[PDB]
């Protein structure tokens, strides 16, 4: 069992979720495909980097991410920066022969995402984009039901990602509100999670037809850096909200809606799927649960079942002794890391890859063009 | 307090809901605006009509609906036939000076709906279309919150009507699956209920962009009239499912989805409204409840409240002593009849009227054209 | 079909729920067992009674309920008065050979209830006590699943009725807080509805062990006056009851009811654990029954939410699809259907005065238990 | 910050929940009170122990737990064994001046628990019992609302822990069904978690009145063999407990726990009724707390579903928005945070062995009550 040395670049507060995954994955899944080692962490300056290494349990620290890419003893690069730095870092890591996990969206733009995909697609490396929510056991359970034929053929998909964290106009202008850094707003940040689920559970997209909305068009800068610390107001040039209708390649239909401006909605990732022989509903705010209705039930006892994920369900062998002992965000990252390291050790590939990341970027570009032209747009299809 | 003689035309099994409303409305709301009298019922033949009069407690019966229209002692005509007969009947009743409540959709087509509206709009009569679900107390409560400014300005609306009663392909080809009688399928039958709610709670529609789907394109005729009694198969030439994006006149955005093919969904009428200062969610399968989230709550105790309707809420004075004593379908019809008879007695008008019925028909025509042309279509606006 | 003339006594504005049931029952259940006629209604004075007759649609009105009992053309007496008048009216109605539906609790104590049971048990009349909530279709569905063996043998029952309508100390003193009139408080008014569901779904009670609590000991009044000085008068009943239960069939359980649970409106629940499944019900969401079958496939097991409609009990008489919506009125319609059916067919109906009396014996045992802080056996009629 | 060396004893594969907490606690809560070090782990034999050390990331392994107690470089002992070994290990750990976190129940009986309490109560060490579920952020939030006066004075408490993992008669005999090893069944294993929440949120118990039930009296085995013939052996503990409760502060309530509720997985609930509001919690949906405030405006009153995050207790150490998702591991991380905080600051932590012992006195009183069919006073330590 090989030690694989991880370099984490950035990650913000949420670096805890990355370093949790690397520390806990072999505890959960044993024998492990390989032993992750928290070898080096990069942050914006050496003091921050040193402190993060202390907090997150990394052996070494640096303010120079290139030093990680050029260290022949780093096996894995974890890219957890904002969207504008993914491509440079990933392409450099791909050329140095490193396995890569990258945060979503894959990049700021479709063209930038293509360059990342092109850099990895022919190398002998494992590449993964962090659509971690598809590894919620309930979501993998939905996939299991679908693949088995348990709900028949899929006709219709509804997926949402509703949030309220920026719904106060005094919430400051950060990079997530700046097209030049993020590329898009709700679309890239939260709709991509839902789009990944649609691709996973339903299939590829054929065409989209969308509307983008910006509800809080100006926000205060933070004068003291990234109430009473306001600087000047600046404009928000990204979407707060996206809705899109979808025609799937396989003839199903659907729709995706995401917003940052839904008071009472925290991390409300949902889908509802209607098949010819049943339906499946999911709500990440209650992520331990999957709801499923089978048409085959006797007429006097039909309806949605609330199924709690546990040992009987996908990834159960790595998780808790009983259903509802409690899945949080961390378990999705632990499962993600397990599958990532399994691909590395077995010389194979993982889903979702940079291929998937790039297909989502192509869907995003189509949504933006559709919204601008007020018309259906076809989505080019990589696979 | 005047006796007002009602003639009910048709109604199917659901005539019980009409005759319940006329019998119970003064019991609930007293003194009543007027005393409904179940004077005469029309059905397809004299025997059926006589039996329905016995079952529903009507004094007289007829197989000739014109005899009701020409009886100068009938004050109110209740039109509960299928969509294809609304216009003839209503226009004849309007010309005879009778007050009219008509089932939805108002007619089979937009043009037919205009003729009904034109026939009544200048008369001194009360005209009402039976979008009864907007008189669910929870829905009137949502309106109260919105009108007060309690959730700020509306940004976004989501409304659905999901059902499964025809999701088995062996369910027979009835008039509801025939464009020549019904005009449309899910659109006219169930999306119109949701569209009425969108107009009530949000405002008028500016434009739509839609997709119509037919999932069960053939059904068996019933050989023994309207398993083992099948006749020949015939085609379904209407939609099983509609989704549409919406631009509202007031600048809000939204979407409406309705289907007959969602296993596990029975009478799942929902809406979710996002305002600048709160959100409102409703589910008719749990109609006693309204969910509302206020942005103004202190940060450590924010979220959706589940509010049970009772004496403190709209129409409470006519209903039960406490919240959750239980609202069913009948109370919506009782409230509807109260407001209808109040307009009659006070020489005024009621909402929704044939104006509202016709505006919905115009929205429906726009959805169908949008779906065919795959493009945005503007909705002409009556008011 | 035969016309059966109903005389309604009392009820306040909720007389409308009775009137609705008699007017609508044949509309819903057709062909109907018989035709209810709203013949006569009694209220406190001639004028109020005539006004109620107009509102509720009765042909005649009276301020003397004995005139209804003595009227040979009245077939059915509906007693909707408070607890202190049920016995006298019911006994006179029985002696005059009327069919009787009586509000719950059947009377204030088991002794007073026994007198009503004795007056009807050997007569050729139909008698029913208005535990209407057992005729919520979801509760009849629970009964169907249990009797078919679908959740196995019942091990355990939890039943609650939680309300908040008097949770405010300023909610005024009414008869419902006065032992001399009501007999008991939460116990009699709302625990009895749950106790009825427990007898219906699980079976007879063998013993109880209970705690009664009064949280608000006085309330504004609106010789109770000569008591007594100042704005308020004493509450001498329970605001809350909880009791543990041994069932005759060896199941265990518990019932809790309260008037002092902020956020709970009409929260009538039960949860039953069987050897092969479980059932959960919440009247605030009365269209639903929740059921978990141990036989489900292991990766797709849990409680399913079943909406009642045509396929479930009473469905043929109700709405054409599930979740069109059951309210309070439909429970009264179903109650009336079964009442008039029993009358038409010369049968009996459950729950009868026998059930009403059995429930009053359970309440007595609860009160005795709470005072002695001891288990009390429940006499089985 | 100081390195504190942990020796973990036992735990089975759920050792991972301990290892996760020690590795992740500083990642979450920063700056951290101290740095946990996974120093040594003990399992049944040298080889299994070395394998566990590799899996869970401990530096050393042993099959003799006394070697950890006697190692002067070990600061913290974590006891994750079954109930029969907690006392001996804890007492030796105390005598050697180690800080101790022990699995619940603290021991098999109140007498055995008293010995552990006595061994630690006057030493300068931090001792904690692993009622981890009280550190679900929603439960700490409940505590916040209660202590601020937001639901008034508590009147009533209902608490449940319903499970189904042994609802099948074929689920095998394990130590958890053997009185000699476990001490009790559902009572000790899961009612204690609820009892801890009741002491935390409401206050001390004054008296209990209880029923214990065994539904499945024998199970397959996988001198218990020389017992004994054939595939199965006897269960001599409770599968289910229910108890009524009088609180020292005059509130009332009840606790019910079972292993035989099909559809219930890890269903840890409570419902508290206060004079000015109510709180409802369900661990199967542990991100939520439901709260109804009587002060809400009358047309917009009901239970609100509050999702925990940065604004609620422990939020600064957890996820950046509500509903990013709390699981079991985060409760263990929060537990560890407070444990190591108390160590770093020379303080104490709740729940301690004092709380563990008080809970064992309540269980004794429940068992006595059930046998006598009587109310039993609970000794207050």
From Swiss-Prot, chains C, D:
<feature type="binding site">
    <location>
        <position position="193"/>
    </location>
    <ligand>
        <name>levoglucosan</name>
    </ligand>
</feature>
<feature type="binding site">
    <location>
        <position position="83"/>
    </location>
    <ligand>
        <name>NADH</name>
    </ligand>
</feature>
<dbReference type="Pfam" id="PF22725">
    <property type="entry name" value="GFO_IDH_MocA_C3"/>
</dbReference>
<feature type="binding site">
    <location>
        <position position="132"/>
    </location>
    <ligand>
        <name>NADH</name>
    </ligand>
</feature>
<comment type="similarity">
    <text>Belongs to the Gfo/Idh/MocA family.</text>
</comment>
<comment type="function">
    <text>Catalyzes the oxidation of levoglucosan (1,6-anhydro-beta-D-glucose, LG) to 3-dehydrolevoglucosan (3-keto-LG). Exhibits high substrate specificity toward levoglucosan and NAD(+) for the oxidative reaction. Exhibits weak activities (about 4% compared with that of LG) toward L-sorbose and 1,5-anhydro-D-glucitol, and activity toward D-xylose is also detectable (1.7%). Can also efficiently catalyzes the NADH-dependent reduction (reverse reaction) of 3-keto-LG.</text>
</comment>
<protein>
    <recommendedName>
        <fullName>Levoglucosan dehydrogenase</fullName>
        <ecNumber>1.1.1.425</ecNumber>
    </recommendedName>
</protein>
<feature type="binding site">
    <location>
        <position position="104"/>
    </location>
    <ligand>
        <name>levoglucosan</name>
    </ligand>
</feature>
<feature type="binding site">
    <location>
        <position position="130"/>
    </location>
    <ligand>
        <name>NADH</name>
    </ligand>
</feature>
<feature type="binding site">
    <location>
        <position position="43"/>
    </location>
    <ligand>
        <name>NADH</name>
    </ligand>
</feature>
<dbReference type="GO" id="GO:0000166">
    <property type="term" value="F:nucleotide binding"/>
</dbReference>
<keyword id="KW-0119">Carbohydrate metabolism</keyword>
<dbReference type="Pfam" id="PF01408">
    <property type="entry name" value="GFO_IDH_MocA"/>
</dbReference>
<feature type="binding site">
    <location>
        <position position="81"/>
    </location>
    <ligand>
        <name>NADH</name>
    </ligand>
</feature>
<feature type="binding site">
    <location>
        <position position="189"/>
    </location>
    <ligand>
        <name>levoglucosan</name>
    </ligand>
</feature>
<feature type="binding site">
    <location>
        <position position="13"/>
    </location>
    <ligand>
        <name>NADH</name>
    </ligand>
</feature>
<keyword id="KW-0520">NAD</keyword>
<dbReference type="GO" id="GO:0016491">
    <property type="term" value="F:oxidoreductase activity"/>
</dbReference>
<feature type="binding site">
    <location>
        <position position="104"/>
    </location>
    <ligand>
        <name>NADH</name>
    </ligand>
</feature>
<keyword id="KW-0547">Nucleotide-binding</keyword>
<feature type="binding site">
    <location>
        <position position="175"/>
    </location>
    <ligand>
        <name>NADH</name>
    </ligand>
</feature>
<feature type="binding site">
    <location>
        <position position="176"/>
    </location>
    <ligand>
        <name>levoglucosan</name>
    </ligand>
</feature>
<dbReference type="InterPro" id="IPR036291">
    <property type="entry name" value="NAD(P)-bd_dom_sf"/>
</dbReference>
<feature type="binding site">
    <location>
        <position position="133"/>
    </location>
    <ligand>
        <name>levoglucosan</name>
    </ligand>
</feature>
<comment type="subunit">
    <text>Homotetramer.</text>
</comment>
<feature type="binding site">
    <location>
        <position position="176"/>
    </location>
    <ligand>
        <name>NADH</name>
    </ligand>
</feature>
<feature type="binding site">
    <location>
        <position position="103"/>
    </location>
    <ligand>
        <name>NADH</name>
    </ligand>
</feature>
<dbReference type="InterPro" id="IPR055170">
    <property type="entry name" value="GFO_IDH_MocA-like_dom"/>
</dbReference>
<feature type="binding site">
    <location>
        <position position="328"/>
    </location>
    <ligand>
        <name>NADH</name>
    </ligand>
</feature>
<feature type="binding site">
    <location>
        <position position="163"/>
    </location>
    <ligand>
        <name>levoglucosan</name>
    </ligand>
</feature>
<dbReference type="InterPro" id="IPR000683">
    <property type="entry name" value="Gfo/Idh/MocA-like_OxRdtase_N"/>
</dbReference>
<feature type="binding site">
    <location>
        <position position="14"/>
    </location>
    <ligand>
        <name>NADH</name>
    </ligand>
</feature>
<feature type="binding site">
    <location>
        <position position="86"/>
    </location>
    <ligand>
        <name>NADH</name>
    </ligand>
</feature>
<keyword id="KW-0560">Oxidoreductase</keyword>
<dbReference type="InterPro" id="IPR050463">
    <property type="entry name" value="Gfo/Idh/MocA_oxidrdct_glycsds"/>
</dbReference>
């Amino acid at each position: 069992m090989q030690n694989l040395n991880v370099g984490l670049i950035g990650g913000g507060f949420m670096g805890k979720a990355h370093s949790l995954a690397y520390a806990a994955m072999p505890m959960f899944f044993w024998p492990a495909p390989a032993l992750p080692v928290r070898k080096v962490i990069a942050e914006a300056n050496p003091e921050l980097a040193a402190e993060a290494a202390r907090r997150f349990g990394f052996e070494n620290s640096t303010s120079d991410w290139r030093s990680i890419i050029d260290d022949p003893d780093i096996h894995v690069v974890d890219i957890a920066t904002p969207n504008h730095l993914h491509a440079e870092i990933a392409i450099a890591a791909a050329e140095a022969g490193k396995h890569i996990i990258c945060e979503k969206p894959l990049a700021r733009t479709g063209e930038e995402s293509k360059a990342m995909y092109d850099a990895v697609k022919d190398k002998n490396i494992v590449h993964m984009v962090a659509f971690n929510y598809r590894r919620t056991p309930a979501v993998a359970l939905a996939k299991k039901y679908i693949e088995e034929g348990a709900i028949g053929r899929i006709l219709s998909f509804r997926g949402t990602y509703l949030q309220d964290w920026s719904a106060d106009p005094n919430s400051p202008l950060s990079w997530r509100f700046q097209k030049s850094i993020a590329g898009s707003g709700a679309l890239g940040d939260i709709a991509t999670h839902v789009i990944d689920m649609a691709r996973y559970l339903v299939g590829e997209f054929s065409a989209v037809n969308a509307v983008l909305s910006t509800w809080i068009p100006e926000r205060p800068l933070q004068s003291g850096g990234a109430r009473g610390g306001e600087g000047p107001k600046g404009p928000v040039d990204v979407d707060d909200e996206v809705m899109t209708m979808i025609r799937f390649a396989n003839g199903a239909v659907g729709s995706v809606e995401a917003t940052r401006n839904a008071h009472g909605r925290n991390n409300y990732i949902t889908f509802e799927i209607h098949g010819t022989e049943g339906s499946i509903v999911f709500n990440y705010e209650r992520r331990d649960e999957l709801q499923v209705a089978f048409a085959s039930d006797q007429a006097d006892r039909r309806g949605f079942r609330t199924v709690y994920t546990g040992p009987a369900h996908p990834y159960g062998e790595g998780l808790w002794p009983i259903p509802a002992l409690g899945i949080g965000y961390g378990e999705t990252k632990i499962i993600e890391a397990h599958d990532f390291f399994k691909a590395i050790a077995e010389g194979g590939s993982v889903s979702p890859s940079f291929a998937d990341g790039y297909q989502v970027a192509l869907i995003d570009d189509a949504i933006v063009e559709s919204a601008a032209k007020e018309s259906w747009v076809d989505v080019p299809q990589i696979s």
